[PDB]
């Protein structure tokens, strides 16, 4: 029977061979069956046979009289087959007809996919109007939302609604947020303990970001002002010090007792659901400035979602690594530092919304700087998390993470020729993160903690690898000094807290605390940020809150 033969083929797709055979079987009894040929085309293009599908679709009878559901499928197929004009005219004919009819599932789907197509067609405003009409059609609201506030508040999530209403809400909210214009200003105070003069780091960073829509994506302009202070050297006597910094180990230094520097950087970039790219500069005003940037591509493969990126970034772990330092004017006066890491990375993830989720990442970078020994690194990271609580407004998870690092050379020292950044020969870390995210009508927050165990080893390294920089007289001394290697393992912990409050439709404020004690020498951060939305966002806030990230940390 035609009905059951059609049903058997259709049930699979909500899958190729059986459905195609069933559709062909219906084609024997009734060669003019429009639904059978539509299903055959759908299954063919689901297999990626676009070239055959576009030829098959032309065999359908004319649209002299057909239901809205069939015309919606035809329009979607034509749009995805690459014939945008026929789909555009079909939707232009369909949408007023959908509006004229009372609220129904057919008309709701027609308006939803029409809004989606119009958003892809290059008319986001008409897409927003069509979404406004679709919410009326889908039963979300009895009356059309006349202003941005009532339009946005209807997009808040609902636990009792069906799939159609939830999809309409999610799509309307996503499009509205994509079309919004945002201005964010954030202040970061960060640093870590160390030795005064080269490692007693305290830094301030003021970040200004403008986010605007462009095509289906968003473009961003970013400006960063960063000030780094590392204290002053402790003089032993006669106004001289002999710390393990620069060439002071060969001759007691003088002159540059205090060390600090500030600079401004710019960045411009763009990002969409698939592609992302960004280019900018190292903060101008430091000793050494280099151009940095990155590009990234993301796509789904099977059940997994993968991302491949290539980037060049600075290292902000210390002043010598980020902006570089100058040797004391009494000994050499030469400039050195400014380590840049350029390389590639590939990441995979799996999360279908259920209780379990996994992710992994691998990266390979080359580290090169001004008068700094060349280096390279390979890094592996992975994580798994089980969601104890997985409500749409409240998530509580506990998981296990693993990290493995290897570096070619250990250049953690601050002597001339070394970059002063952490670089172990073999590092392993296992952590157990516990996380809780929640949001309310006007409050959103995230709390996180993690205990970890880490092992690290570093090899013996010469103190002055760049022998040509050392003066001829000190040569015999410089070859006789080396930094002793060693291995160490132990426990550590990290904690984080994010909070965000909506005080006005166009005004959001938030604070973030990041404490690092996992024996990784990472600096601790404390930031306050304010965000202004031109159109206003009265719907559900971000979960978690999403503060800005310093451009040097990308």
Residue numbers in the entry: 602 to 615, 618 to 1157
Give the original sentences from the paper that presented this experimental model.
To gain experimental insights into the architecture of full-length BcsC and its interaction with cellulose by cryo-EM, we reconstituted the protein into a lipid nanodisc in the absence and the presence of cellotetraose. The obtained cryo-EM maps underscore the high flexibility of BcsC’s periplasmic domain. At lower contour levels and for the sample devoid of cellotetraose, the cryo-EM map confirms the solenoid architecture of TPR#9–19, while the N-terminal eight TPRs are insufficiently resolved or absent in the experimental map, Fig. 4a. Although the density cannot be identified unequivocally as a cello-oligosaccharide at the current resolution, its shape and interaction with BcsC are consistent with it representing a cellotetraose molecule, perhaps bound in different binding poses. Supporting this interpretation, no additional density at this site or elsewhere is observed in the absence of cellotetraose in a map of similar quality, Figs. 4b and S10. The cryo-EM structure of BcsC reveals that its periplasmic domain is flexibly attached to the β-barrel.
